[PDB]
Design a protein around this nucleic acid. Structure first.
Ligand SMILES: [Mg+2]
Ligand SMILES: [Mg+2]
Ligand SMILES: [Mg+2]
Ligand SMILES: [Mg+2]
Ligand SMILES: [Mg+2]
Ligand SMILES: [Mg+2]
Ligand SMILES: [Mg+2]
Ligand SMILES: [Mg+2]
Ligand SMILES: [Mg+2]
Ligand SMILES: [Mg+2]
Ligand SMILES: [Mg+2]
Ligand SMILES: [Mg+2]
Ligand SMILES: [Mg+2]
Ligand SMILES: [Mg+2]
Ligand SMILES: [Mg+2]
Ligand SMILES: [Mg+2]
Ligand SMILES: [Mg+2]
Ligand SMILES: [Mg+2]
Ligand SMILES: [Mg+2]
Ligand SMILES: [Mg+2]
Ligand SMILES: [Mg+2]
Ligand SMILES: [Mg+2]
Ligand SMILES: [Mg+2]
Ligand SMILES: [Mg+2]
Ligand SMILES: [Mg+2]
Ligand SMILES: [Mg+2]
Ligand SMILES: [Mg+2]
Ligand SMILES: [Mg+2]
Ligand SMILES: [Mg+2]
Ligand SMILES: [Mg+2]
Ligand SMILES: [Mg+2]
Ligand SMILES: [Mg+2]
Ligand SMILES: [Mg+2]
Ligand SMILES: [Mg+2]
Ligand SMILES: [Mg+2]
Ligand SMILES: [Mg+2]
Ligand SMILES: [Mg+2]
Ligand SMILES: [Mg+2]
Ligand SMILES: [Mg+2]
Ligand SMILES: [Mg+2]
Ligand SMILES: [Mg+2]
Ligand SMILES: [Mg+2]
Ligand SMILES: [Mg+2]
Ligand SMILES: [Mg+2]
Ligand SMILES: [Mg+2]
Ligand SMILES: [Mg+2]
Ligand SMILES: [Mg+2]
Ligand SMILES: [Mg+2]
Ligand SMILES: [Mg+2]
Ligand SMILES: [Mg+2]
Ligand SMILES: [Mg+2]
Ligand SMILES: [Mg+2]
Ligand SMILES: [Mg+2]
Ligand SMILES: [Mg+2]
Ligand SMILES: [Mg+2]
Ligand SMILES: [Mg+2]
Ligand SMILES: [Mg+2]
Ligand SMILES: [Mg+2]
Ligand SMILES: [Mg+2]
Ligand SMILES: [Mg+2]
Ligand SMILES: [Mg+2]
Ligand SMILES: [Mg+2]
Ligand SMILES: [Mg+2]
Ligand SMILES: [Mg+2]
Ligand SMILES: [Mg+2]
Ligand SMILES: [Mg+2]
Ligand SMILES: [Mg+2]
Ligand SMILES: [Mg+2]
Ligand SMILES: [Mg+2]
Ligand SMILES: [Mg+2]
Ligand SMILES: [Mg+2]
Ligand SMILES: [Mg+2]
Ligand SMILES: [Mg+2]
Ligand SMILES: [Mg+2]
Ligand SMILES: [Mg+2]
Ligand SMILES: [Mg+2]
Ligand SMILES: [Mg+2]
Ligand SMILES: [Mg+2]
Ligand SMILES: [Mg+2]
Ligand SMILES: [Mg+2]
Ligand SMILES: [Mg+2]
Ligand SMILES: [Mg+2]
Ligand SMILES: [Mg+2]
Ligand SMILES: [Mg+2]
Ligand SMILES: [Mg+2]
Ligand SMILES: [Mg+2]
Ligand SMILES: [Mg+2]
Ligand SMILES: [Mg+2]
Ligand SMILES: [Mg+2]
Ligand SMILES: [Mg+2]
Ligand SMILES: [Mg+2]
Ligand SMILES: [Mg+2]
Ligand SMILES: [Mg+2]
Ligand SMILES: [Mg+2]
Ligand SMILES: [Mg+2]
Ligand SMILES: [Mg+2]
Ligand SMILES: [Mg+2]
Ligand SMILES: [Mg+2]
Ligand SMILES: [Mg+2]
Ligand SMILES: [Mg+2]
Ligand SMILES: [Mg+2]
Lengths: 72, 109
RNA sequence: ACAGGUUUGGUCCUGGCCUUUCUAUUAAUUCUUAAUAAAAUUACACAUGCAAGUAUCCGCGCCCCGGUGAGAAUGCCCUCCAGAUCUUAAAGAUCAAAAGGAGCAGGUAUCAAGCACACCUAUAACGGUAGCUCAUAACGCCUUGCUCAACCACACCCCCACGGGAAACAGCAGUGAUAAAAAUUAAGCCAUGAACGAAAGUUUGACUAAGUUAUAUUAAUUAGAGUUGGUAAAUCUCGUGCCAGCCACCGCGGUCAUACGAUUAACCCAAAUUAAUAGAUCCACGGCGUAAAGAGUGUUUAAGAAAAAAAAUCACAAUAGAGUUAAAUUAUAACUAAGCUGUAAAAAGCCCUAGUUAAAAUAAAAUAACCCACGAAAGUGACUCUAAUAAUCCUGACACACGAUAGCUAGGACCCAAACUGGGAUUAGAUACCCCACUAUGCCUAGCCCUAAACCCAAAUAGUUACAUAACAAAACUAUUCGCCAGAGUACUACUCGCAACUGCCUAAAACUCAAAGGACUUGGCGGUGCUUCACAUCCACCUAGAGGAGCCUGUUCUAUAAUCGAUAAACCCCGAUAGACCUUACCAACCCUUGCCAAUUCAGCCUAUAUACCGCCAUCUUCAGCAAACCCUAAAAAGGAACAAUAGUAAGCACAAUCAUAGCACAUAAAAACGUUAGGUCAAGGUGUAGCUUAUGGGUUGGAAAGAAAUGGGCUACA
């Protein structure tokens, strides 16, 4: 009966958790790896604007904070 | 559902067909890599003569040779068509018999 | 769609996949001739010949036809017309750029924000506001000519061509390279159209007439292809033996194949026929308790829907505070006894233990509750007081505020419980179930996390009980809404977006694989489920006499032999044998015989292969009560079909029972014991279907076999 659907899920979940334990630190890399792409693409997004709006420098008092890498 | 819903979602469109192994063309020209053999799915058993081929689409693909008996040497050129073979996993490409380097499966008279 | 095949032992239901119809390329197999239409892989590169000229100068023409579909979500449709040209006694007419907007317009929201995309001043280029677009899809990305008496776009590329690469057939023919994709380097301006001409007229690879090609229709002169298990028209004999192979789906091949390969007959199409690939066609105005789908909860925005009634009260346990404690337990003393704890049984464990008598903190709230209240839901039931339960009450989010347990951060708390872990048992193992300790943790204060079988699997608000049974469950439905569902996996997954999370949450695909996957039911069978009732040589308890040990007999099994076969769980094993020295005899070894028992036969003869082709005879459930035609019933039937103060069953038959036999009764024993089950036993009793052998798998003569290292079944005789 419908348990037979749940069994599949139950297994697929278990078999996933196990995986994410072994793979943990590999995972941890690739997460942060993409956060450093994010923050960069983000930056370029704004850089694009100065250069598109004709300004040479980034406007006064702009440090362009890091949102994605926010921790603690 | 309701009418406002059927309005907001439009009428249903019939989704465009996913192109198969032949990528939409009727047939493909191909070049042989290695002639070999595959075993069928469960309820029936045999051993089928298969090839590995390249297509003018520069893709490599596993294909099937129909008939009993053949000569298939590496670097031979073939024609292929989209008949899927019901025995085997994942062999979607038949070889046309009678053209190029595969002649009509011989008669014993 | 007039539908059909395919899930299961079967039945519905849901739900994909496929068949059947029509068109187009390309391929394979065939191919006779005309006529007519159509002609096409390639904005890849192009040899050569041509595709604009006219005309008394000047002028006028010179991508106009013609080619292409590269680009662009381009655009369709509709306003409004600058300009160019034509006509003409100045206003008509044809194209129509730019610029606009009623409406319609590819996919994708995993592209959700874009980043100045607005306006105001008529001052006369400066100032002033702080706007505009966007979930009714902005801004992206991806694919793409089209809505077709035509329209849009390009013209070697750099969207645009100054300039730069570089030297352009996407004009007609042709050609390399590329691709499943193959027309003549052809004749004429004779008709039409075009350009010029005052005109005859000249030019025109536009076009006209041909040429090539089964690409499509038509006509006949032309016969071939595919099929033949089912859906779906149509089959005989061989060969092959899960091999060679075939199928669009279900499937076919494991020795007797209408599914393979080849014959033989047929079927159906037919100058075509099949195969392939693209289309046309094809979901849902259907659904959401159990099937895929009602979000964990409420309110509002945007957007909508609207006769009348629609705030009454807790039968009292919302929430948040602050204060309080009855039972129990624990520290820790006083006595007292050596044990105490703990299981199916124990062990380990503790004796700073146990019983009694005292006793704070912490934690948790018997009975009442057979009640059914309060909160939006989560949740809430010891006591008291304070604060207190939105809306004159329709729906509503990605917005807002909440949201069990567990978990995370910091600080307290710690009776008891307890993941983890360490002992102890159990066990083949026991990382578990049982035992014993002890920890994170449950507890408070503050902050997070935002998940549940967050389920009553049943959305909100008004209604009705009309119509009406797929099944099961909680009986069937309107109306208004929002939310959600397009086979199954893959997948509470990969990538994206956002979040006090960084083994997280949310949103949520495709490749690939399969012809299913699912829901409910029906009879069986099964159950270390529960309940009753039995077992009468019978499970237990009980009684007697034996087997297993010893010698021997005899049968298997193994080794040995040149040297039978069959049986071999219960249902083989002193078995076919109520019976092998020769014979029997089927076996091995040598020799020999070929119409070789008979009335006749290109005929005899075969203990050769099929017991999974069989008849015969039996085993077995079984000393079991059922089997089965003919009917009858069931808001449908796969199947079921009784109640005796009776509710849909009737029925001859075969079983049981009854009678027979064991010389009178009776009981006992004997016999009997269907339908089926075990593809149980036996082609060596005999007979046969299918296959094989025929100077031999046939028929004769002569010898030879049946030895024991053991291992075991049953007997016999003992042990006095
Ligand atoms: Mg799985
Ligand atoms: Mg990543
Ligand atoms: Mg095929
Ligand atoms: Mg099923
Ligand atoms: Mg079946
Ligand atoms: Mg079943
Ligand atoms: Mg299918
Ligand atoms: Mg062709
Ligand atoms: Mg054109
Ligand atoms: Mg055109
Ligand atoms: Mg294109
Ligand atoms: Mg584009
Ligand atoms: Mg668009
Ligand atoms: Mg216009
Ligand atoms: Mg994605
Ligand atoms: Mg200004
Ligand atoms: Mg250009
Ligand atoms: Mg130039
Ligand atoms: Mg060109
Ligand atoms: Mg050309
Ligand atoms: Mg040109
Ligand atoms: Mg060529
Ligand atoms: Mg063609
Ligand atoms: Mg000419
Ligand atoms: Mg012609
Ligand atoms: Mg024709
Ligand atoms: Mg002929
Ligand atoms: Mg084999
Ligand atoms: Mg045969
Ligand atoms: Mg068939
Ligand atoms: Mg055949
Ligand atoms: Mg034809
Ligand atoms: Mg329909
Ligand atoms: Mg329902
Ligand atoms: Mg469900
Ligand atoms: Mg799905
Ligand atoms: Mg709900
Ligand atoms: Mg909600
Ligand atoms: Mg959820
Ligand atoms: Mg309003
Ligand atoms: Mg109303
Ligand atoms: Mg408090
Ligand atoms: Mg107390
Ligand atoms: Mg006490
Ligand atoms: Mg105490
Ligand atoms: Mg006990
Ligand atoms: Mg002890
Ligand atoms: Mg109670
Ligand atoms: Mg209650
Ligand atoms: Mg209220
Ligand atoms: Mg509301
Ligand atoms: Mg919570
Ligand atoms: Mg907690
Ligand atoms: Mg603790
Ligand atoms: Mg304490
Ligand atoms: Mg404890
Ligand atoms: Mg242990
Ligand atoms: Mg065991
Ligand atoms: Mg147990
Ligand atoms: Mg403790
Ligand atoms: Mg709590
Ligand atoms: Mg709940
Ligand atoms: Mg529930
Ligand atoms: Mg739900
Ligand atoms: Mg709602
Ligand atoms: Mg309400
Ligand atoms: Mg009604
Ligand atoms: Mg029914
Ligand atoms: Mg799917
Ligand atoms: Mg989860
Ligand atoms: Mg996830
Ligand atoms: Mg989001
Ligand atoms: Mg006995
Ligand atoms: Mg018995
Ligand atoms: Mg004995
Ligand atoms: Mg003995
Ligand atoms: Mg024997
Ligand atoms: Mg032997
Ligand atoms: Mg035997
Ligand atoms: Mg046998
Ligand atoms: Mg037997
Ligand atoms: Mg005996
Ligand atoms: Mg003898
Ligand atoms: Mg013999
Ligand atoms: Mg055999
Ligand atoms: Mg038998
Ligand atoms: Mg028999
Ligand atoms: Mg009876
Ligand atoms: Mg009946
Ligand atoms: Mg008598
Ligand atoms: Mg009697
Ligand atoms: Mg008897
Ligand atoms: Mg009787
Ligand atoms: Mg047998
Ligand atoms: Mg047997
Ligand atoms: Mg015989
Ligand atoms: Mg015979
Ligand atoms: Mg002989
Ligand atoms: Mg003899
Ligand atoms: Mg013995
Ligand atoms: Mg004796």
């Amino acid at each position: 009966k419908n348990i037979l659907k749940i069994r599949r899920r139950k297994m697929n979940h278990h078999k996933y958790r196990k995986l994410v334990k072994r793979t943990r630190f590999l995972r941890r890399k690739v997460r942060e790896g993409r956060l450093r792409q994010k923050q960069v693409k983000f930056e370029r997004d704004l850089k694009r604007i100065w250069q598109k709006a004709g300004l040479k420098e980034a406007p006064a008092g702009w440090q362009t904070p890091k949102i994605y890498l926010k921790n603690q | 559902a309701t009418l406002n819903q059927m309005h907001r979602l439009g009428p249903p469109k019939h989704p465009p067909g996913k192109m198969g192994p032949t990528a939409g063309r009727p047939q493909l020209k191909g070049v042989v890599l290695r002639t070999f053999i595959r075993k069928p799915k469960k309820p029936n058993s045999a051993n089928r003569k298969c090839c590995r081929v390249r297509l003018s689409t520069g893709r490599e693909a596993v294909c099937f040779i129909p008939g009993e008996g053949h000569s298939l040497q590496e670097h031979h050129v073939v024609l292929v068509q989209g008949g899927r073979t019901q025995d085997l996993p994942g062999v979607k490409l038949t070889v046309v018999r009678g053209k190029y380097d595969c002649g009509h499966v011989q008669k014993k008279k």
